[PDB]
Amino acid sequence: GEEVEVHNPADLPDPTRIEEILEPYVKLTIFTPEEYVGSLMQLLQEKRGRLVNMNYLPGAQKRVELVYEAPFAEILYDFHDRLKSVSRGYASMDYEQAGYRPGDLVKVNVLVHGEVVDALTFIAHREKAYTMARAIVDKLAEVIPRQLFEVPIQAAIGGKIIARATVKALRKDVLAKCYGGDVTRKKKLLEKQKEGKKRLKAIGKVEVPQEAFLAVLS
């Protein structure tokens, strides 16, 4: 049967036995003046709204009304602002719920240092999710606590990573008193360090700070 992937994209049913993930869609009507229409349609395209209908209320001459079925999530921040800006303010909007619908959606998992961070599991449309993952991976890179070992940051569409970033690798300048000249003495200290980073990489459980979550989730 059916039920709702609720306030937890992580808490799915097992995408093993699955066949339809449903977005909420919405009946979206746009009262533009003139042929800002051209702008408007490009906007609703990348918002993945199907164009169902358009009608001219003639008289002078501008006035066009556009009807769209668009994923409910694809408004919600961003849209209203961009409706207003590409139309110098003259575009209006109204909508009502108009049900649910199948969507080609992917589960994108985010693992830091090999461990899946559930708190950052989301869900997107395969046309966009890379660009979504290409983004979080890099913002997470800039706010994760730099460790004693280099920390990988990754995003996977089920068992296949698609976007990769790496945190350093805080290290000790082990060669600081090395004005001998003999390269063997630099190698000795360099080997030991390389071996240790392996060891700290393998057993190194990094935790994401609650200050990083807020930084990625603004």
Interface residue list for Mg ion (CB under 5 A): 179
* Nearest one of 155, 104, 101 to 125, comparing CA atoms: 104
Q: Which does 93 bind (CB under 5 to 8 A by kind): Mg ion, other proteins, RNA, none?
A: none
In degrees rounded to 5, what are phi and psi of residue 52?
Answer: -105, -25
Binding segment for other proteins among 3-11, 66-74, 178-186, 193-201 (CB under 8 A)?
178-186
In degrees rounded to 5, what are phi and psi of residue 212?
Answer: -80, -40
- Cα–Cα dist 107/87, whole Å: 34
Q: Is 183 in the site for other proteins (CB under 8 A)?
A: yes
Pairing outcome for strands 105-112 and 122-125: antiparallel
Helices (H), 123-209: 129-141, 183-202
Q: Is 210 in the site for RNA (CB under 7 A)?
A: no
Least CB distance to RNA at residue 130 (A): 7
- Cα–Cα dist 8/123, whole Å: 10
Question: Could you say which of 59, 181, 210, 218 contacts RNA (CB under 7 A)?
Answer: 181
Q: Is 171 in the site for RNA (CB under 7 A)?
A: yes
Interface residues with RNA (CB under 7 A)?
15-17, 134, 147-148, 150, 152, 154, 158-164, 168-174, 176, 178-182, 184-200, 203-204, 207
Interface residues with other proteins (CB under 8 A)?
181, 183, 186
